[PDB]
Design a protein around this ligand. Sequence first.
Ligand SMILES: CC(C)(COP(=O)(O)OP(=O)(O)OC[C@H]1O[C@@H](n2cnc3c(N)ncnc32)[C@H](O)[C@@H]1OP(=O)(O)O)[C@@H](O)C(=O)NCCC(=O)NCCS
Length: 149
Amino acid sequence: MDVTIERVNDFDGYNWLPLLAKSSQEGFQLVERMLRNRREESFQEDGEAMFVALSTTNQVLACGGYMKQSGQARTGRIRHVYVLPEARSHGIGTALLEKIMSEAFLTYDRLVLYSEQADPFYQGLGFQLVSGEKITHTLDKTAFADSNR
Ligand SMILES: CC(C)(COP(=O)(O)OP(=O)(O)OC[C@H]1O[C@@H](n2cnc3c(N)ncnc32)[C@H](O)[C@@H]1OP(=O)(O)O)[C@@H](O)C(=O)NCCC(=O)NCCS
């Protein structure tokens, strides 16, 4: 699918209802949490960003971003990654993560995330599976660079 990945500078300029509905249906709170908490965690400051994938008809097909990982130094957390069920398996998640990773590694020396359901996806991107309470996957910049330089 042809999508464009855009930085969210104005949350109120997108129709989020489809993403909210589908994610809720599947039992996921991550889109709801992102949007409900957007005054406190706005993804607008230095060291953070939120992206959306837009279809050729400017419908939101996915979201995902990054911000500082609390309590860890030089570490960013990839957050709120979700692709609409009907838009999966067409390379959107990959394009979104590749954009996130490349930008976030300008600020952070390590990226971490928590995903119970998408281990194969994250390992395919180079993340290492870890046994943690707060994180499932991690990637060091040096590893990212080795796969880039
Ligand atoms: C995980 C997720 C972000 C991946 O994004 P995507 O746009 O579907 O992924 P891509 O098309 O870029 O494919 C990259 C990898 O993601 C995985 N993937 C593909 N389709 C998937 C899907 N329907 N569900 C979960 N992972 C999927 C595959 O490992 C794929 O690797 P491959 O192309 O070599 O087969 C997205 O599918 C999602 O938000 N999934 C929700 C969780 C989920 O699907 N749970 C399991 C089913 S209920």
